[PDB]
Design a protein around this ligand. Structure first.
Ligand SMILES: C/C(=N\O)c1cccc(C(C)(C)NC(=O)Nc2ccc(Cl)c(-c3nc(C(F)(F)F)cs3)c2)c1
Ligand SMILES: C/C(=N\O)c1cccc(C(C)(C)NC(=O)Nc2ccc(Cl)c(-c3nc(C(F)(F)F)cs3)c2)c1
Ligand SMILES: C/C(=N\O)c1cccc(C(C)(C)NC(=O)Nc2ccc(Cl)c(-c3nc(C(F)(F)F)cs3)c2)c1
Ligand SMILES: C/C(=N\O)c1cccc(C(C)(C)NC(=O)Nc2ccc(Cl)c(-c3nc(C(F)(F)F)cs3)c2)c1
Ligand SMILES: O=c1[nH]cnc2c1ncn2[C@@H]1O[C@H](COP(=O)(O)O)[C@@H](O)[C@H]1O
Ligand SMILES: O=c1[nH]cnc2c1ncn2[C@@H]1O[C@H](COP(=O)(O)O)[C@@H](O)[C@H]1O
Ligand SMILES: O=c1[nH]cnc2c1ncn2[C@@H]1O[C@H](COP(=O)(O)O)[C@@H](O)[C@H]1O
Ligand SMILES: O=c1[nH]cnc2c1ncn2[C@@H]1O[C@H](COP(=O)(O)O)[C@@H](O)[C@H]1O
Ligand SMILES: [K+]
Ligand SMILES: [K+]
Lengths: 341, 341, 342, 343
C-alpha cells in the first residue's frame, strides 16, 4: 500500500521553450505498426457511441471508430462494410471472447475491417491471451488490439500472445463502476504511463481508453506515451452517435450507458450505469475543439510531433486547491464555451 | 515529529488486477470465521436492533453467512431468538454479549439455546473488562467460540488472542451511524486497521473481522484482500425486509429506521446517531449483488480462493481526483443500478 | 521552502490504547497556570457575544473559567469581575489589550479580585505584547498573566521570558476569523498547539488551545497534543448565559456571534473577523456535560487516568478526506438530534 | 517521471514572525523595473473588462499602475494612454501583442509617453516573444518592457537575455482561464512565482505575480514568494472604474468579466482559452484598494517585515490540507453582515 497513482486531473504539463506555433504541429500517430491515423482519436465500441455513421465521421476527421459488437455478426459485418465502401476509410470492429468469436472475426475480416479490438473487462486473462493467439494463428497479417489492461506485466503477456496494440483502462470510464463494485482499477494516467513505458521497450503501442473529459486530458495521455486516445462520453453526445434523444429543462440529451450496464446487457451483476449527456451537435465541431486543444498544448510544449511531445513533457502534481485554480473559478459563467462545459 | 503515519480507508485505495486464469463464476468464497466455524460466503449481519434478529439471522445463514442477534432485549427474549434460528433447520447463529453484571447469565441462556458463536463487543475491546470477560467465558465454556471486539491495533489482537478469543472484530469509528471519531477523537481508518490487525492475526493464527464502513461490494473485496476472514455490515443490510422494524413511507419512497446502538434511542453521552435508510427489499437480492461484486474482483485479481486473494493483492493509493475518476462521473444517471446507490 | 505540512484537528485521529480505566474513572483536573487549577480544561472566549458575568459565573461553577471581554469600559468590566468573585468564591478572568489605558484597566480588574489576566492581541509575538507583560508583572508580581495569541515555539520562549505564566495558541483557527484569508498568515491549530506545547512544557509554561474547536473529539486532540485547557467561542456562544438577545428566524432561535475584529465588535477599519448567527444551544450546563463526556470517553479509549498521561501516550495518525468522510456519519438520513453532534 | 507537487495560494500559509513593527509603519514600495517605482505593488490587468484610461488613472492615483488593453485600434490605445499622462503625469502601461503591426502599436503608445509596455502572450517563452523583445529594445533601448506570461526559471533567463526589464508569471491561474483544461499546460501559481522569483533575483530582473489572486492574503503570499508586484483582473473587474456599465440581475448589481482568450473577446474557427461571465459589483476602486492594502500591511506586521524585501527574506510557508483550508476560512457560522474584505 505504499505507492500513489495519479489520474489526469492530478497533474499538469510544464510549458517548454517553443519555436513552434500550434497550427504548425502534426498529430500523425501509429495506431499499430501498420495503421497510421492522422489524428490520435478513436471512438469507443459502445452501443451508444459507435456504429457506421459515427465510424465514417471519425475516419474522415483522421481518426477511427470501433464498431461495437452488441448486434448480430451479420449486422456488424454490414456496419463495417458500410464504412469501407464510403471511400477508403479505415474501420475497426469490436470482438469479445465467446463461442461466437471466430465467426464474428471471419465476418468482419471478409467485410474488410482494418483492425479488430478484442476487448474484455479483464484483458490480462487466459481467455484473451488464447483469443489473440487463436486469431493471429488464423489471420497473421490482421491487426489486433487487445484490452483492457492496467499493468506492464499485462503489456508483455499480450505482446507475447501477438497483439499489435494494447488498450489501457480498468475503471476510468465515465459510466464505469468496476472500481466501486469490484474494488479493482488503476488511476488512468499512472496506468498509461507504466504501460506506455513497457510498451516502448517491446515495440508495441498503447491506447488510453476512458476517463478523458477535456482536450487537455488527451494532451496528458499522449505526453504519458499513449499512441491514441479513446472516448465514449466525449463523442456520445454527438449527432452521429446512436442514442435516443431525451428532453429535460430546455435541453436535448443523448442516452449514454456502460456496455456492462443492465440495459446494455439486455441476475445481472452490472459494472456500469445508464444515463444521458447533453446533445453536442455534429462530431466535426467537437473534433475541431479537441484537436485545437491538443495543438495548443503541443505549442506550449514546443513539440512539432507526438513523439517530441512524449520525450519533452514534464509533469507536476497539483493539489485539490491547484485543481480549483486550474478550472475557471469565482466567475458566474453566462456564455457557453465550445471548449468548456 | 509526532504526526507521521497516514492511515487509509477503502476509498483511498484500489486493487491492481493480476493475471487471471480464472473466471468470477469459479471462485470459492468459503471462509473460516473461527477454526470450528466455516461460512460459505464471508459476510455477517451486524449486532444491532435495526439489523439482526431471528428473521435476519435465519436469512443470513440460509445465504451462507451468519447473523449475530443483538443484546438490546431481555435475556429471555435473546435466548428465544437464538432458538428460533437453531430450530429453523441446522443454521449457524451468533449472539452478542456485553460486559455486564448479568453477563454469564446471558452466555448461559444463549448457550442453552445452542448458539454457535458469541460476540463480546464493546466500544473499546482492547480493555480490562473485555480481557477478563473472554477469559471468564473461556473458563466456563472452553468449547465455545468467542469473537471479541472492537479493536484497531496489532497490540489489541495479541492481548485478545492471549486471553482466549477465537476471532477479533476490527473497527473503531468507521460505522455509518458512528460518531466515536467526532465525540471522542479516536479511531483508525478501517482499511489500515484491518490491514495492521490482519497481519498480527495471521502470524498468531487468529482471524479478524472487518466491521463497519463498508458500503459497496468493492469495499468488501478490499477488506478481504487486506486479510480479514469476513465482513460485518449494518447499513448494507438494515434496509432489507428481514431487518426488524416496519417500513415508513416518506415522500413516495420507502424507508426503514437505522440507528447506532450508541445512539440515544437504542440506549433507551452517545456515540452514534439515529436515522432512516432506504428500503432495499429482500436480503437475497442484496446478497446476490454483493456476492457477484466480490467474485468479479477476485476474477480481476486471479484468485480462486480468499487466501490466494490476500497472498497476491497489490494496493495503490488514489487521490481525491482518482476517487472522482473511480466513480461514475460527468454523466446524468437516469436508471438506478442494483449495486450502485 | 514550502515543504513542511501542518495539520489541524480534522486531519488526525487518536489510535486507541489498552485501557484499564473506565470513562467515569478518569480525572480532568488541569493546571491553567502554576497558581490556578481547574476541575475541567474548558475556557469561554474573551468575546462580547460569549463571556460576561453570567457566562463566567456559569463556567466557574462547572469547573472551568470565563474570561470577561474588553469591549466595555473599565468601570463596567471591573464590576463584571466583581459580579463573579462575589458569587460564592469563583475564579474569574479578564481581557486586556495593548492600549494606552492598559494599566488602568489592569488596576481596576485587580482591585475587583480578578484571578487571571489575558493580554490577548492579534499578534502576541510582538514588541507591544512583550513589553506589556513585562510592565504588568513588574507592577503585580503575583498576578497570573496569560499572553497571546501565538503559533510558534519561538513565541512561547519569548513570552515566557517576558514573564507570562501561560500562553494562548491560535492564529486563524477561529470559526469567525478571517486573519488567514486577509493577511495570509497562520498555522493549522493542531500543529500549532503541538509545537508550542512542546516548548512550553520544557520551560514549564502551560499553553491554551484557543479556537477552531467544534466537537468534543477536537478538545481531546488538543489535550493529547499537550494543551492545558481549551478555549471555545462558537461552542458557548449559543448558550443562555452568553450575552445578546435571542433573534428568531423562521421558527428557529439563534444568537449573534461575531469576531472581535469584525466591523460589528470594533464599532477605515480593515476587519479580520466576520459577524453572524448560530443556533440557540440551551443552558451551558448541558453543553458542558456533553463536552466532558466526550473527553472522558476519549481518555477511556486511550487508557489515560489524567490529562498528563494522555499527552504522553497519545499516538496520532493522519486521515485523508475519505477517512474524514468515514469518521463522520455517512449515508444516513439523520432524523433525530444527537445532543453532541451537528 | 511524476514526482514534484506544485502549490498554489490556497495550499499554504505564512508563519508569523517575531514583530517589532505595526501595520501602519510598513512600507509597500516596490521596483516594477529598475526605472519604475510603485507606491503600492498592485497592477490592473490588460483586459477589455478591467482596464482602460479611467481605471489606469484610478490605479495610478492609488500608487499602482494599470495596463490599458490592446483590444482596440492603435490610435485608440495611444489616445487612451495619452488620457492618463494628461491627468497629472500619472504612470501608464500598454499591452502589446506579437502582431504584424507590433512595432506600429509600440510607436503610437511611445509617442503618447507610455511608461512601460507589456508584451503579453499565451506563451511568453516562445520565439515570437523572444524576438519581439529584442526588436523593441533595439529601437527603443530605454523603453521599459515587461514580457510574459511564463512559469519556469528557464523562461525568466531567456527573456532577460532578450532584454526584458521585468517578466510576468502565470500560465493558467486566471479565474476566467481554461488553458490548463483545454491545453493541459500550466504551473500552480505559488510554486511558479517562487521558482521564477528565485531565478529573477539571481539575474537582477523582477517578476510579476499575475492571475489567480482572490483575497488580500493571497497577495501577501505572492509577495513573500518574491514577486515585485501583483496583477489582478477579477478583483478589479467588479469596480465602477472598469469598462462596461453596471448590470442588474435579480435585484443585485453585476459587471461583465471575461477572458481575453474567450469567444466574445476574440470576436467558429476559434478555440478559446477563457470564459465569459459576470461578477458582483463591488463599488469604487478606492475602497477595494484600501481593503487590499490593509490586508498586506496586516500580513507584513504579522511577519515583522517593514519592507517587501524583508518580507521575502524571512517568510516561512507551511502547507495546509483541505481540512486546514476549511479551518482557515470562516466555518460553522451563518454570516449575517457583509465583511468588506471577505465574500
Ligand atoms: C468493460 C467492462 N468492464 O470493465 C464490462 C463490459 C461488459 C460486461 C461487463 C460485466 C458486467 C459482464 N462484467 C464482467 O465481465 N466482469 C468481469 C470481472 C472479472 C473477470 Cl476476470 C472478467 C472476465 N471475463 C472474461 C471473458 F473471458 F469472459 F471475457 C475474461 S476475464 C469479467 C463488464
Ligand atoms: C483577534 C484579532 N485578530 O486575530 C483581532 C481582534 C480585534 C481587532 C483586530 C484587528 C482587526 C485590529 N487586526 C489587527 O489587530 N491586526 C494586526 C495584524 C498584525 C499585527 Cl503585527 C498586529 C498587532 N497588534 C498589536 C497590538 F499592539 F495591538 F497588540 C501588536 S502587532 C495586529 C484583530
Ligand atoms: C460501539 C459503540 N461505540 O463505538 C457503543 C455502543 C453502545 C453504547 C456506546 C456508548 C454510547 C454507551 N459509549 C461507550 O460505551 N463509550 C465508551 C467510551 C470509552 C470506553 Cl474505555 C468504554 C468502555 N466500556 C467498556 C465496558 F464497560 F463496556 F466494558 C469497556 S471500555 C466505552 C458505544
Ligand atoms: C492568455 C491567453 N491564454 O493563456 C490568451 C489570450 C488571448 C488569446 C489566446 C488564445 C485563445 C488565442 N490562445 C492562444 O494564443 N494559445 C496559444 C497556445 C500555444 C502557443 Cl505556443 C501560442 C502562441 N502564440 C504566439 C503568437 F502568435 F501570439 F506569437 C506565439 S506562441 C498560443 C490565449
Ligand atoms: O459498463 C462498463 N463498465 C466499465 N467500463 C466500460 C463500460 N462500458 C464501457 N466501458 C469503457 O469505458 C470507456 C469509455 O469511457 P469514457 O470516455 O470516459 O466515457 C470505453 O472505452 C470502455 O473502455
Ligand atoms: O452507536 C454506534 N456507535 C459506533 N459504532 C457503532 C454503533 N452502533 C454500531 N456500531 C458499529 O458499527 C457497525 C455498523 O456499521 P456500518 O456497517 O457502517 O453501518 C456495527 O457493526 C458496529 O460494529
Ligand atoms: O475577529 C476575530 N478575528 C480573528 N480571531 C478572532 C476574532 N475574534 C475572536 N477570535 C479568536 O477566535 C476564538 C474563538 O474561536 P471559535 O471558538 O472557533 O469560534 C477566540 O477565542 C479568539 O481567540
Ligand atoms: O482568456 C484567457 N485565458 C487565459 N488567461 C487569461 C485570459 N484572459 C486573461 N488571462 C490572464 O488572467 C489574468 C486575470 O486573472 P484573475 O486575476 O484571476 O482574474 C490576467 O492578468 C491575464 O494574465
Ligand atoms: K484557471
Ligand atoms: K478561520
Amino acid at each position: 500500500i505504499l505507492k500513489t497513482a495519479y489520474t489526469f486531473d492530478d497533474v499538469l504539463l510544464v510549458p517548454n521553450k517553443s519555436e513552434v506555433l500550434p497550427n504548425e504541429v502534426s498529430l500523425k500517430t501509429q495506431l499499430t505498426k501498420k495503421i497510421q491515423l492522422n489524428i490520435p482519436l478513436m471512438s469507443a465500441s459502445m452501443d451508444t457511441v459507435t456504429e457506421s455513421k459515427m465510424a465514417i465521421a471519425m475516419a474522415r476527421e483522421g481518426g477511427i471508430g470501433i464498431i461495437h459488437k452488441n448486434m448480430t455478426i451479420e449486422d456488424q459485418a454490414r456496419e463495417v462494410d458500410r464504412v469501407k465502401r464510403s471511400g477508403g476509410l479505415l474501420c475497426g470492429a469490436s470482438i469479445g471472447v465467446t463461442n461466437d468469436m471466430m465467426e464474428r472475426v471471419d465476418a468482419v475480416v471478409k467485410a474488410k475491417v482494418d483492425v479488430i479490438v478484442l476487448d474484455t473487462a479483464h484483458g490480462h486473462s487466459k481467455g484473451v491471451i488464447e483469443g489473440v493467439k487463436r486469431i493471429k494463428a488464423k489471420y497473421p497479417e490482421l491487426q489486433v488490439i487487445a484490452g483492457n489492461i492496467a499493468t506492464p506485466e499485462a503489456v508483455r503477456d499480450l505482446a507475447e500472445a501477438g497483439a499489435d496494440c494494447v488498450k489501457v483502462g480498468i475503471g476510468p470510464g465515465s459510466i464505469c463502476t468496476t472500481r466501486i463494485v469490484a474494488g479493482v482499477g488503476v488511476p488512468q494516467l499512472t496506468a498509461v504511463m507504466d504501460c506506455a513505458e513497457e510498451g516502448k521497450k517491446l515495440g508495441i503501442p498503447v491506447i488510453a481508453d476512458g476517463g478523458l473529459k477535456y482536450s487537455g486530458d488527451i494532451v496528458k495521455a499522449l505526453a504519458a506515451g499513449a499512441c491514441a486516445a479513446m472516448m465514449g462520453s466525449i463523442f456520445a453526445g454527438c449527432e452521429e452517435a446512436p442514442g435516443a434523444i431525451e428532453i429535460y429543462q430546455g435541453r436535448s440529451y443523448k442516452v449514454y450507458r456502460g456496455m456492462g450496464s443492465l440495459g446494455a446487457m439486455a441476475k445481472f451483476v452490472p459494472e456500469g450505469v445508464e444515463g444521458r449527456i447533453a446533445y453536442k451537435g455534429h462530431l466535426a465541431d467537437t473534433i475541431y475543439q479537441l484537436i485545437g486543444g491538443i495543438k495548443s498544448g503541443m505549442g506550449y510544449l514546443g513539440a512539432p510531433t507526438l513523439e517530441n511531445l512524449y520525450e519533452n513533457a514534464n509533469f507536476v502534481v497539483q493539489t485539490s486547491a491547484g485543481f480549483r485554480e486550474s478550472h475557471p473559478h469565482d466567475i458566474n459563467i453566462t456564455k457557453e464555451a465550445p471548449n468548456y462545459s
